[PDB]
Amino acid sequence: GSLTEDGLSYKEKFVVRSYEVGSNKTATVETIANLLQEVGCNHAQSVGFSATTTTMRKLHLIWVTARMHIEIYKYPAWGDVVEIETWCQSEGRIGTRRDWILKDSVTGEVTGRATSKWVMMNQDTRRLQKVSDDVRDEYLVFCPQEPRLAFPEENNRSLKKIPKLEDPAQYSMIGLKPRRADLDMNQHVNNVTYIGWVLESIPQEIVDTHELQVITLDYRRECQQDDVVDSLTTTTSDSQFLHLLRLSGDGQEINRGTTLWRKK
Amino acid sequence: GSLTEDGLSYKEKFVVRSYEVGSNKTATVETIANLLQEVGCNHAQSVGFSATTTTMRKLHLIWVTARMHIEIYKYPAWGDVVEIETWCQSEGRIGTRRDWILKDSVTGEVTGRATSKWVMMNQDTRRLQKVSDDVRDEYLVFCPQEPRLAFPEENNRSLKKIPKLEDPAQYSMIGLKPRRADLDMNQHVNNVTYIGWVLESIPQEIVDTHELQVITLDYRRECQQDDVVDSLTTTTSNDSQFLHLLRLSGDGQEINRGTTLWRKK
Ligand SMILES: CC(C)c1cc2ncccc2[nH]1
Ligand SMILES: CC(C)c1cc2ncccc2[nH]1
What we know:
Chain B: Plays an essential role in chain termination during de novo fatty acid synthesis. Possesses high thioesterase activity for oleoyl-ACP versus other acyl-ACPs. Substrate preference is 18:1 > 18:0 > 16:1. Chain B: Its EC number is 3.1.2.14. Chain B: One of its GO terms (biological process) is fatty acid biosynthetic process. 2 copies of one chain form a homodimer. By secondary structure, chain A is an alpha+beta fold. Chain A has 5 helices and 12 strands. Chain A has 2 domains: 2-159, Thiol Ester Dehydrase, Chain A, CATH 3.10.129.10; 171-263, Hotdog Thioesterase (Thiol Ester Dehydrase, Chain A, Roll). Chain A has helices at 29-46, 54-58, 133-140, 191-200, 204-209, and strands spanning 2-3, 10-15, 61-72, 81-91, 95-104, 110-122, 128-129, 171-176, 210-219, 229-235, 239-247, 253-263. In chain A, strands 1, 2, 3, 4, 5, 6, 7, 8, 9, 10, 11 and 12 form a 12-stranded antiparallel beta sheet that branches. In chain A, helix 1 (29-46) runs antiparallel to helix 4. The relative contact order of chain A is 0.15. Bound molecules: 2-(propan-2-yl)-1H-pyrrolo[3,2-b]pyridine (2 copies). One 2-(propan-2-yl)-1H-pyrrolo[3,2-b]pyridine (ZVB) is lined by residues 64-66, 119, 128, 191, 219-222 of chain A. One 2-(propan-2-yl)-1H-pyrrolo[3,2-b]pyridine (ZVB) binds at residues 64-66, 119, 128, 191, 219-222 of chain A.
């Protein structure tokens, strides 16, 4: 992988692996989300990151995902090469955004796009906060200053408000727990694990007859290594679903989201 | 990746990813086991597989892992490039073996080795069987005919008999269930998931103070997509050794047994 000529975005190519594909012999949406994280990390490394800046390290600040939105037109097959371009943008004092474009390396055609919103948090107190002037200055060095959006379209799916699923849910998968492979290097549950848990409550007959086209997930609270999660889904419709992940015991919400599926 | 000059082994290089590493910023043993599977698959594709031979597809036969043995001297760090060489050998009518050697791409030093035993099974009845003459002929085309062992040594750990853990276990992790990411393209639980489940019952204090040096795992029965597993571990021992057992949560049917050896950091 490498920064592009202007140094304001990063590109990397990936060959889809045997264990990364599902029943159609194409990459799962969790494989796509892991590749998005990987290219994001390689971009941060290339522009001088620790994924914190110097000021964030001095103030004990970290970024946490507030929302992830992914749209896939074609999933890459086992052995195919996918090229992913990523870039970041400051959104004033609210937070930052990381966007991605996925292309088939042979045809050059756009096969998917994604966008994520990140908010600042004090890592000790876990309290959210606005982005300071020093942090915005550090981002200006490696972000495009004119807007560059993976989802430009007015009133597009990536910015829609998601409601809270009402009990009783139509479908559920109860008692989900993370194992060590679900943790990142800092022993926190990897963001992609929550996507897997959301999808666990979709009936297998939908997965067998449809392809996932769009997923929008809001992240509200972290699942700890010793927590247990319930995944709830209700059809709202193409087939569309409303999702909710909550802690098994007290019912505390950890995520809410929506998925749109196209019949094969 | 590519077959070597003689066409009897295959090599591939991998850059260790951010999500593939644990607390020490080095690849987990599950990441190593997934890379071993990936290079094995690329080798099979390179020599004409479709992972069965022509005769196997005609008779509805498949290979299943009976044992996996991995020894790691140094885990590769995040961003490091690891080169893995793999090859297969026929073991008469018993089954086949796939071996691997892991090297640091910059130093050329061997950082790990692995060996796996595979047995033939009828895909429909799930009944094990001996390897036929036609299948052995197909393997002779792409295997070295003289022995080539990742674990040559006389009384090496890879061939040791593993006993069955006696209740009560010292440690346990109960109610483990596979999710869709744990399944392969044929909707079977990926072999590497069983390694993760074995390790779940090791106390976190051991993982925080030691590095896993050797793991030997016997596979006896498949965990179905709707099954639930219990992972049991008992210490048997600067080195710590454990005995492991995975069994179905309900009836207690054994699915795997194994041993791990850990060295203090
Ligand atoms: C699970 C992670 C991504 C996460 C925790 C959290 N807390 C507050 C707001 C957003 C948040 N996101
Ligand atoms: C690896 C799993 C699917 C497996 C099932 C099995 N059955 C008999 C002997 C070995 C076996 N291994």
